[PDB]
């Protein structure tokens, strides 16, 4: 129940949490590297007629267009979820702002210090 | 740029830039012409001392407030007060700053229209907006519901608000305020021998009221105690000596708030107009209004009022509801702090009455959508 | 909301993103270079989309915790 | 964590003036030989504007945790940071959200008690009276055994 | 995939995935626009609160049900209610789930056709099916015969069924239901002094009706007892205090069911329309219908109705037949439980109105073979 013990415990657990957060961040970084590496579909670029080269690059263009279309769809969906999150953030911030909304202001500049000049 | 949050009030003009904690310059709103003849030549005697300068030369002036009860009765003097406020107390030309005046509820239209016409023609501001003095005091408390009793110095008004939706049919505006308490105190002081008559001595009586008077928790018991013992008699030194002793005038002056029959007013006290204002509201938001009763304004600074009012309302209200009275220590500047918060909001930035809009519709624009 | 318009925007982007290249407008080696450029661009796109899925999962986290708190309010 | 960043950011224009002026005012010596090793009290008293006590207590304890009893230029800067508002001020709320996301990566709608158990196992701090008590009271802030998001949200918030 | 068993109802929307025991989300079907002005800026005030959110802000709203008597009178509000139900109370997009709405018997065709057109065009479901609200309540009881009296909140209908063969010529639909009982209770409360007028206070009167009212076994004896003793007067605390005491209004409000002459309706009570519905059936299935009388719907939850109804029918019916009234404890959700059971059947899996079928025949497909 001691304050010193409580602060030591929370400090150590907070640092372990921060360490695990950096661990998760670098873990996601490695996962992204793996996913990008496995995304590539290698092509046998040598010994083919140039018209076939154009054909293959156009096929990859179609693949790219489809993939970026999937990215657009998921971005739009996550954006709608973003709008929903903004609404729920409005809900909680309103329920708490009923008491702590006007906290956003600028104070303590010159009236709090410059007083003996007058 | 930054906005100017002015707050005319009646008794103290409070102004300052938006986004701070306290008004930059607070000074009484009085304009006093000299009344004697004047024999020294070249002394540099002006024709009218305004603001805090006329509270130091008040011995030879005739101070007269330009705002009687919320409404403005002397437009030239009010223009002079505004000019002083802009140029000497803040030293910012109004050509480069939006302004946010404040106005009591249920005031005459012509007052508001003349105010906006002055601000747009004489001082030539970029854009000004007029807000009701109670919504700001509700902003400053960080709430979004609650019924706020803003007992200023001119007029006491009681605006209930729920979930951000104001209830226009439940505003109870009463014209008893600090000035009438000053006059009543000056009238009951004559029962001991002290006579204050001059308009300059009204300031001395106001100082007595501020420093000594307090609101009694129970009136009859205090009247009985002050009539037997002498533990209440507090003395006070006039601006020239000759100390005076105030007996049971201490809690009889601010008692007028809860019994306006003392100064001959018919209406019920501030303890019962709040309950009436609540009962006009719908049956489902009365608990929230009971629990979030807010006090504001200068006159609610009497020592011991937040307990007397709670006792009275608890007597009136049903026994089950919880009665809570929010009395922040920064009561006096609550309206101005709320004004600063409102002017600092991003969502509010498009509600100003832009000058081109005024040029197209005239001063009657204020009653329109841009409220 | 109004999926016809949203799909319309998607198709406008895709036709815009359909950077079809003409015949005598590069070298065969340059054609390979552009193909690999699209490859890398789409790889970065996949990384962005993977992080998007992670953040969307966190969005669902916030949604469920938020609605749980909402119910707790009652 | 943010401690070293706050220490490095002490090199500025305002707190540099503060340290210089304080040194020229009430840091000179010429005492009776008592060695004001605890002169941090003198600095706090001579500040003229006491900060929140958290900074003062962190300076009192965290500094010379080995019990050196000596303050150097770097420790002078540490004290100066303890003077002004150089704190991380609760880190980033995004850090709180990301941490709670890693906690409830299992999608419980809240940080489960087993998340706390594993985190304590990682931190290895001895289970004192405060240990487990903090976890349960935060989880049972409603005191009904139900752990909600805002509970641990405010439990970890306000701290760096 | 799983099917969505929605059940529009009138007063409470009950929904949930097929195959469970209880609906996942149950919330009143009211859409209330705010009616006051609103002064707080940036509070995030919406233009219409639907569902259970408008039962908490009802102090400043004007709640209005979008379904009057089974039929739907305000299609935009009903669409809003459905959108809320799908997206916020269940959080499942309708593009990937069949739906099973429910509809009262003898309703206008246009209502059903518009319902299917909305479900197929706006929400774009894969396949939807509309079922009569009484057959489901018969499913939930695990029977296959019996005459079910489904006294909802909008409309009371009485569908007799034998061996799975419904008798279309013996359906007796009566428009007295819970809402009329709420209005009548609100009208007889005025005899003691309590006046409820606002559309928000109708909810308070509904709560009084739910918590206090009960059906008397014998009406005249109860009227005589309540007029002499005071053992019936039960008190109730309003949402703000000021407790009220309900005397013989307790059993007079739900008595309207058995004597619809109280609210001026001509028809006979629910005790005699069941007997008439039986007597229209053939002479050889009357014993089975007598023995398997089923109660359902919310309004049949009054304490003591399963005995009053049995006494009345036993008085009407021949003395030899046995009269039994099935009153399961899960009466309120009986229709939805039956809907879940029906949607979970394998034999039913090919009766859905597939979207390609709607594209070929238009909304009038619902009256066709796919009923
Ligand atoms: N500390 C105090 N104690 C008692 N009364 C006060 C105190 N301060 C101010 N007052 C009264 O309140 C008045 C100032 O009210 P104020 O809030 O400035 O009015 P306005 O709403 O016009 O700004 C003064 O006239 C004075 O009578
Ligand atoms: N416990 C109860 N006691 C008495 N009446 C009730 C009770 N519960 C609900 N009711 C009445 O029944 C109505 C709800 O009926 P419900 O079955 O939901 O209608 P629907 O068929 O539209 O779903 C409410 O309006 C209420 O008046
Ligand atoms: Mg005021
Ligand atoms: Mg029903």
Curated annotation (Swiss-Prot), chain A:
Record region (Involved in binding TNC and actin): 89-110
PTM annotation (Phosphothreonine): residues: 11, 38, 89, 103
Location of the region described as Involved in binding TNC in the Swiss-Prot/TrEMBL record: 1-39
Residues that bear Phosphoserine: 2, 4, 110
Keywords: Acetylation, Actin-binding, Muscle protein, Phosphoprotein
Post-translational modification: Phosphorylation by STK4/MST1 alters its binding affinity to TNNC1 (cardiac Tn-C) and TNNT2 (cardiac Tn-T). Phosphorylated at Ser-2 and Ser-4 by PRKCE; phosphorylation increases myocardium contractile dysfunction.
CC terms in the record's Gene Ontology section: cardiac myofibril; cardiac Troponin complex; cytoplasm; sarcomere
GO biological-process terms attached to the record: cardiac muscle contraction; heart development; intracellular calcium ion homeostasis; muscle filament sliding; regulation of cardiac muscle contraction by calcium ion signaling; regulation of muscle contraction; regulation of smooth muscle contraction; regulation of systemic arterial blood pressure by ischemic conditions
GO molecular function, one term: actin filament binding
Domain of life: Eukaryota
UniProt site (Involved in TNI-TNT interactions): 40, 57
Family: Belongs to the troponin I family.
Assembly and oligomerization: Interacts with TRIM63. Binds to actin and tropomyosin. Interacts with STK4/MST1.
Function noted in UniProt: Troponin I is the inhibitory subunit of troponin, the thin filament regulatory complex which confers calcium-sensitivity to striated muscle actomyosin ATPase activity.
Record protein name field: Troponin I, cardiac muscle
Organism: Mus musculus
This protein's encoding gene: Tnni3
Residue window of the full protein shown: 42 to 159 of 211
From Swiss-Prot, chains B, E:
Catalytic reactions of this protein: ATP + H2O = ADP + phosphate + H(+)
Record keywords, A-Z: Acetylation, ATP-binding, Cytoplasm, Cytoskeleton, Hydrolase, Methylation, Muscle protein, Nucleotide-binding, Oxidation
Short name of one Pfam family: Actin
InterPro entries assigned: Actin, Actin/actin-like_CS, Actin_CS, ATPase_NBD
Subcellular location(s) of the protein: Cytoplasm, Cytoskeleton
GO CC annotation: actin filament; cell body; filopodium; glutamatergic synapse; I band; lamellipodium; synapse
Primary location group: cytoplasm
Annotated function: Actins are highly conserved proteins that are involved in various types of cell motility and are ubiquitously expressed in all eukaryotic cells.
Name by which UniProt lists this protein: Actin, alpha cardiac muscle 1
Origin species: Mus musculus
Organism placement in taxonomy: Eukaryota, Metazoa, Chordata, Craniata, Vertebrata
Swiss-Prot record, chain D:
Entry-linked InterPro entries: CALM/Myosin/TropC-like, EF-hand-dom_pair, EF_Hand_1_Ca_BS, EF_hand_dom
Highest taxon of the lineage: Eukaryota
Gene Ontology terms: cellular component: cardiac Troponin complex; sarcomere
SUPFAM superfamilies named among the record's database cross-references: EF-hand (SSF47473)
Binding-site residues for Ca(2+) 2, renumbered to this chain: 104, 106, 108, 110, 115
Domain (EF-hand) ranges: 15-50, 51-86, 91-126, 127-160
Binding annotation for Ca(2+) 3: 140, 142, 144, 146, 151
Transmembrane intervals: none
GO BP of this protein: cardiac muscle contraction; diaphragm contraction; muscle filament sliding; regulation of ATP-dependent activity; regulation of muscle filament sliding speed; response to metal ion; transition between fast and slow fiber; ventricular cardiac muscle tissue morphogenesis
Location of Phosphoserine modifications: 97
Positions with a binding annotation for Ca(2+) 1: 64, 66, 68, 70, 75
Keyword Repeat listed: yes
Keywords: Acetylation, Calcium, Metal-binding, Muscle protein, Phosphoprotein, Repeat
GO MF terms, alphabetically ordered: actin filament binding; calcium ion binding; calcium-dependent protein binding; protein homodimerization activity; troponin I binding; troponin T binding
Record-linked Pfam families: EF-hand_7, EF-hand_8
Biological role: Troponin is the central regulatory protein of striated muscle contraction. Tn consists of three components: Tn-I which is the inhibitor of actomyosin ATPase, Tn-T which contains the binding site for tropomyosin and Tn-C. The binding of calcium to Tn-C abolishes the inhibitory action of Tn on actin filaments.
Additional notes on this entry: Cardiac muscle Tn-C can bind 3 calcium ions per molecule. Domain I does not bind calcium.
Family from the record: Belongs to the troponin C family.
Name recorded for this polypeptide: Troponin C, slow skeletal and cardiac muscles
Gene (UniProt): Tnnc1
């Amino acid at each position: 129940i001691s304050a010193s013990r409580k602060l030591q415990l929370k400090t150590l657990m907070l640092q372990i949490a921060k360490q695990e957060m950096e661990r998760e961040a670098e873990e996601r970084r490695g996962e992204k590297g793996r996913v990008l590496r496995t995304r590539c579909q290698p092509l046998e670029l040598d010994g083919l007629g140039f018209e076939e080269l154009q054909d293959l690059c156009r096929q990859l263009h179609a693949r790219v267009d489809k993939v970026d279309e999937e990215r657009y769809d998921v971005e739009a969906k996550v954006t709608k979820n973003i709008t929903e999150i903004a609404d729920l953030t409005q809900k909680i911030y309103d329920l708490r702002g009923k008491f702590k909304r006007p906290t956003l202001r600028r104070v303590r500049i010159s009236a709090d210090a410059m007083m003996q000049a007058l | 740029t930054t906005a100017l949050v002015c707050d005319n009030g009646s008794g103290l003009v409070k102004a300052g830039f938006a986004g701070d904690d306290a008004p930059r310059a607070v000074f009484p709103s009085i304009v006093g012409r000299p009344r004697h003849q004047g024999v020294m030549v070249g002394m540099g005697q002006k024709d009218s001392y305004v603001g805090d300068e006329a509270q130091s030369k008040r011995g030879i002036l005739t101070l007269k407030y330009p705002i009687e009860h919320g409404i403005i009765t002397n437009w030239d003097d009010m223009e002079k007060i505004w000019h002083h406020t802009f140029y000497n107390e803040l030293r910012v030309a109004p050509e480069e700053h939006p302004t946010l005046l404040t106005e009591a509820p249920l005031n005459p239209k012509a007052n508001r229209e003349k105010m906006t016409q002055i601000m747009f023609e004489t001082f030539n501001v970029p854009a000004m907006y007029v807000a009701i003095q109670a919504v700001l005091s509700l902003y400053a408390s960080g709430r979004t519901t609650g019924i706020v009793l803003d007992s200023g110095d001119g007029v006491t008004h009681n605006v209930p608000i729920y979930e951000g939706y104001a209830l226009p049919h439940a505003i109870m505006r009463l014209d008893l305020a600090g000035r009438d308490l000053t006059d009543y105190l000056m009238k009951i002081l004559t029962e001991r021998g002290y006579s204050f008559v001059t308009t300059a001595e009204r300031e001395i009586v106001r100082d007595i009221k501020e420093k000594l008077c307090y609101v009694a928790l129970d009136f009859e018991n205090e009247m009985a105690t002050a009539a037997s013992s002498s533990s209440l008699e507090k003395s006070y030194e006039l601006p020239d000596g000759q100390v005076i002793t105030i007996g049971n005038e201490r809690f009889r002056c601010p008692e007028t708030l809860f019994q306006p029959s003392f100064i001959g007013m018919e209406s019920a006290g501030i303890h019962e107009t709040t309950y009436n204002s609540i009962m006009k509201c719908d049956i489902d938001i009365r608990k929230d209004l009971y629990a979030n009763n807010v006090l504001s304004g200068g006159t609610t600074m009497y020592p011991g009022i937040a307990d007397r009012m709670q006792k009275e309302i608890t007597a009136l209200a049903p026994s089950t509801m919880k009665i809570k009275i929010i009395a922040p220590p920064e009561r006096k500047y609550s309206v101005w702090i709320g004004g600063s918060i409102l002017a600092s909001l991003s969502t509010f930035q498009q509600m100003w009455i832009s000058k081109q809009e005024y040029d197209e519709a005239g001063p009657s624009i204020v009653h329109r959508k841009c409220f | 909301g109004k999926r016809q318009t949203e799909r319309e925007k998607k198709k406008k982007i895709l036709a815009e993103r359909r950077k079809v290249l003409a015949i005598d407008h590069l070298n065969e080696d340059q054609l390979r270079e552009k193909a690999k450029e699209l490859w890398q661009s789409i790889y970065n796109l996949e990384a962005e989309k993977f992080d998007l899925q992670e953040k969307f999962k966190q969005q669902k986290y916030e949604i469920n915790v938020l609605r749980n708190r909402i119910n707790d309010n009652q | 964590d943010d401690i070293y960043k706050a220490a490095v950011e002490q090199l500025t224009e305002e707190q540099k003036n503060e340290f210089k002026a304080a040194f020229d005012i009430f840091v000179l010596g010429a005492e009776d030989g008592c060695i004001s090793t605890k002169e941090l009290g003198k600095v706090m008293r001579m500040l003229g504007q006491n900060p929140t006590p958290e900074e003062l207590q962190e300076m009192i304890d965290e500094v010379d945790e080995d019990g050196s009893g000596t303050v150097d230029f770097d420790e002078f800067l540490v004290m100066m940071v303890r003077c002004m508002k150089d704190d991380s001020k609760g880190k980033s709320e995004e850090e709180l959200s990301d941490l709670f996301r890693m906690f409830d990566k299992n999608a419980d709608g809240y940080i489960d008690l087993d998340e706390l158990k594993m985190m304590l196992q990682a931190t290895g701090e001895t289970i004192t009276e405060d240990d487990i008590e903090e976890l349960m009271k935060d989880g049972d802030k409603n005191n009904d055994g139900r752990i909600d998001y805002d509970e641990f949200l405010e439990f970890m918030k306000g701290v760096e």
